[PDB]
């Protein structure tokens, strides 16, 4: 019925900044050369979707269909597409892997010259769109737009996964889980037997703890202001639990005492510059490594020159440093092989129509992840 | 004729901050357990000597004998010493290598648990001193105090060198040349065929240029506000020369445009937090590595989180990442084997009595290195 034809379906639309989303009937165009049309089965809600909704003065960033944590099935492919075919399970990616540039061929990064981030980062979505609604063009957030029953993505931003994978759970691999896990594994490169510290225990932080654990860290200290987050952190692998509010001296001093000078690796999963500094200063001199995972821009992050001169290394990453087309398929298999957890992240589930309820919980830090059905 | 006796000799003493030095007759006590008494034959003047005297000026760090880039002959050793004997050529060090702690045992660092830094870091001198003058105790800068005919340094902070080494030149290895060269080769790990940028062209920056050349870099851009240094930069292997004042755009933009994005490796060798930020940002996304070498503890260094999240790495270096007793002897052998340059760093030579003149030259960037006779 659908193949070779324009589709009419439902989608959560953000017509403008600071306004609740409205579920609309949109038209999805057929896939053009080097593109794939996907029927989305599930999608997580991430803090980056809210950042755009609440913090975008960029009028040209709207109207837009948000979402970048989904999983689905190939409905059709555009001209010149041999890589994919109808029926295969896939996961759209917010970063590209053209596989031909200087960055794609280097094992040191997951960067690329293609994608909206290089073409148009200001509006946070590609210039070209395959969505229309009430005669108006509606943008595709990060080139993924998973808050729609049907989406169209360029093949260099699509990962083919195991045909047995559960779409209503693996969808988190599109962003959140891969970010925390990879930051520990790929970026920090946590080693067996080491001591680690993770700041912030949301989905990114919890995934970071799981990453430290998979790498074989001997000690993993989970740090968070909210003591209600400790039980899940234990389930993911953390060995120690520290609440900064419980100590009058800076958190770096506390961790320093507990570890005899600081940890081997630390990861910031809050997105606060004051936490970013303490995270670095909590590391041991000589070989301590700290990774900025959480992000903000409103403010500069800073430290005293001696911190780095004494031997510490400061790094950062996007999407956990994973080269998408290679990393996501491996993570799907790891979950299926029982080496990686995912179910434990999903605290709420609700229909696409309840998207505003999901945004509110997230806004008030009332959940880890909320997965929506489409 | 001096063994077992207190020595009276000449030393340039700084009674207080911001004041010119005074050639005084001081008493040098006999070496205590595990210590070496050394007759200094030559010592260079480094900007770090000026930092304490003019910038930091820590109030409890005076009176003091500065100097930490010398070379000499062993005069006598304290009990427990078997590695050194009178008449052997040595180079004192501003950092320790006890060889038994966790840091000394790791190939990842040149840190140690001993030294003035681990007890009196802000003072810039150990708590104990072997110098006396006018019945007043006088501190030994960095535990080396080379602006004296005779000094006393603990053995873990002294490197023994080749018997045929020219003391009037190898003294540069005491700090400046090992620092710069090392920061490139050891800390940044410059790769063959890569592109680099060195900010600041004094002896440390010029040594950094040399290191980039030794590592086989394809392009080395020298950056300095004072264009008079470009000639020596070329001597040491630089391929490009940029004076920030000749461009309206911020320096980071000039470099990016010159390289189509940014350089692979960069190094700051000035001691200015603003320059430190610029060096980091002149690096390419994905795999760019920037290293701090300049010294200051009066201000914080900063940047935007995105700089690191895009794929950049920020590090710092202390004495070029060389393990004192291991690295220095090898650098001497390299100079003797015609693999590294040293003489080209020495632009001025003058007696100890002219110390204030050498300092003044440095103060006005009117020299690379001035080396004193005693
Ligand atoms: N690098 C990437 O690819 C990428 C992608 C998406 C999101 N992010 C970042 O991930 C960050 C967090 O994501 P999340 O979904 O887990 O968020 P979340 O809001 O679910 O969790 C954040 C946690 O941090 C804790 N916290 C806050 N201040 C703290 C402090 N001062 N000290 C200790 N703990 C503190 C909170 O109590 C909370 O438990 C965001 O800020 C975002 O910028 C990064
Ligand atoms: N990390 C260590 O172990 C270590 C060792 C030795 C020296 N240091 C520090 O190294 C720094 C330099 O030492 P030095 O003796 O070579 O100094 P120097 O004063 O001889 O050279 C500094 C050079 O930087 C240049 N410069 C100043 N501002 C600049 C700018 N804005 N842009 C580009 N160039 C600029 C100056 O013109 C000068 O040529 C100092 O801060 C010193 O304290 C650290
Ligand atoms: Zn690419
Ligand atoms: Zn996200
Ligand atoms: Zn020095
Ligand atoms: Zn040691």
Swiss-Prot record, chains A, B:
Annotated positions binding NAD(+): 200-205, 224, 229, 293-295, 369
PTM annotation (N-acetylalanine): residues: 1
GO molecular function term, any single one: alcohol dehydrogenase (NAD+) activity
InterPro entries the record matches: ADH-like_C, ADH-like_N, ADH_Zn_CS, GroES-like_sf, NAD(P)-bd_dom_sf, PKS_ER
Keyword line: Acetylation, Cytoplasm, Metal-binding, NAD, Oxidoreductase, Zinc
Gene3D superfamilies membership: Medium-chain alcohol dehydrogenases, catalytic domain, NAD(P)-binding Rossmann-like Domain
GO biological process, one term: formaldehyde catabolic process
EC class (word): oxidoreductase
Main location class: cytoplasm
Catalytic activity: a primary alcohol + NAD(+) = an aldehyde + NADH + H(+); a secondary alcohol + NAD(+) = a ketone + NADH + H(+)
Compartment list: Cytoplasm
Protein origin, superkingdom: Eukaryota
CDD domains documented for this protein: liver_alcohol_DH_like
Listed cofactors: Zn(2+)
EC number(s) reported in the record: 1.1.1.1
Binding-site list for Zn(2+) 2: 98, 101, 104, 112
Additional note from the record: Functionally related to class-I mammalian enzymes, but structurally related to class-III.
Assembly: Homodimer.
Name recorded for this polypeptide: Alcohol dehydrogenase 1
Organism annotation: Gadus morhua subsp. callarias (Baltic cod)
């Amino acid at each position: 019925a659908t193949v070779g034809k324009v589709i009419k379906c439902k989608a959560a639309v953000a017509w403008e900044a600071n306004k609740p989303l409205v579920i609309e009937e949109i038209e999805v165009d057929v896939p053009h050369a080097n593109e794939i049309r996907i029927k989305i089965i599930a999608t997580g809600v991430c803090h980056t979707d809210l950042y755009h909704l609440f913090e975008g003065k960029h009028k040209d960033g709207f109207p837009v269909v948000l979402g970048h944590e989904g999983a689905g099935i190939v409905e059709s492919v555009g001209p010149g597409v041999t890589e994919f075919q109808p029926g295969e399970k896939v996961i759209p990616l917010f970063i590209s892997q053209c596989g031909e540039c200087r960055f794609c061929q280097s094992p040191k990064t997951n960067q690329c010259v293609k994608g909206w981030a290089n073409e148009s980062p200001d509006v946070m979505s590609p210039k070209e769109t395959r969505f229309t609604c009430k005669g108006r063009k509606v943008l595709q957030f990060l080139g993924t737009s998973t808050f729609s029953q049907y989406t169209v993505v360029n093949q260099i931003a699509v990962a083919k996964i195991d045909p047995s994978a559960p779409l209503d759970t693996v969808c988190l691999l599109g962003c959140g889980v891969s970010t925390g896990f990879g930051a520990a594994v790929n970026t920090a490169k946590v080693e067996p037997g080491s001591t680690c510290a993770v700041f912030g225990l949301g989905a990114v932080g919890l995934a970071a703890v799981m990453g430290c654990h998979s790498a074989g860290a001997k000690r993993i200290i989970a740090v968070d202001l909210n003591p209600d987050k400790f039980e899940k952190a234990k389930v993911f692998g953390a060995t120690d639990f520290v609440n900064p509010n419980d100590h009058s001296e800076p958190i770096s001093q506390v961790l320093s005492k507990m570890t005899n000078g600081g940890v081997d690796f630390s990861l910031e999963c809050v997105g606060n510059v004051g936490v970013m500094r303490n995270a670095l200063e909590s590391c041991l001199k000589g070989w301590g490594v700290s990774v900025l995972v959480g992000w903000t821009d409103l403010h500069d992050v800073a430290t005293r020159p001696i911190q780095l001169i004494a031997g510490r290394t400061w790094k950062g990453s996007m999407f956990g440093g994973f080269k998408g087309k290679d990393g996501v398929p491996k993570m799907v298999k790891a979950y299926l092989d029982k080496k990686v957890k995912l179910d434990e992240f999903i605290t709420h589930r609700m229909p696409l129509e309840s998207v505003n309820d999901a945004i509110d919980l997230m806004k008030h830090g009332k959940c880890i992840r909320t997965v929506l059905s489409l």
